[PDB]
Amino acid sequence: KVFGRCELAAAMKRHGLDNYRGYSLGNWVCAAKFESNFNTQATNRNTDGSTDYGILQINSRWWCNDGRTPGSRNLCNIPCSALLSSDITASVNCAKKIVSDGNGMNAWVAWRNRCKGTDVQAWIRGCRL
Ligand SMILES: [Cl-]
Ligand SMILES: [Cl-]
Ligand code: NA
Ligand code: NA
Numbered sequence: 001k002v003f004g005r006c007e008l009a010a011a012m013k014r015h016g017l018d019n020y021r022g023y024s025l026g027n028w029v030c031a032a033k034f035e036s037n038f039n040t041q042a043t044n045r046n047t048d049g050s051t052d053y054g055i056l057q058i059n060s061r062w063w064c065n066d067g068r069t070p071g072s073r074n075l076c077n078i079p080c081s082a083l084l085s086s087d088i089t090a091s092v093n094c095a096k097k098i099v100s101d102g103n104g105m106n107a108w109v110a111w112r113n114r115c116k117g118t119d120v121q122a123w124i125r126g127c128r129l
Pocket of ligand 3: 024025026027120121122124
């Protein structure tokens with residue numbers, strides 16, 4: 001599913017991401033835009049052989065099991081395919097674990113390079129939330 005901007009913002013609010021660990025909703029919407037273009041099906045392979053999955057591009061080395069990333073961990077205890085669903089619950093629950101692991105949203109490269117230090121509230125402007 002390709003979400004609209006305000007549709008995704010509302011879904012992320014419903015799932016508890018607004019101000020989760022101090023990150024306002026616009027940060028999460030901005031990260032999703034640049035990680036996946038709001039597409040739950042997005043996948044991208046990395047040089048080390050791991051793969052990123054879903055709307056927030058969660059990496060199989062650490063967070064999910066895709067059956068082809070040797071020695072990796074499954075810290076969210078889920079198959080990576082679960083992160084491609086039109087229902088964002090599994091992606092959100094896993095992201096909550098990631099953002100709590102000490103490095104905050106700096107774990108998402110696109111957030112650090114394209115959202116951090118910008119007016120992220122613009123990503124939710126105009127939306128009924
Ligand atoms: Cl959803
Ligand atoms: Cl933080
Ligand atoms: Na915001
Ligand atoms: Na893994």
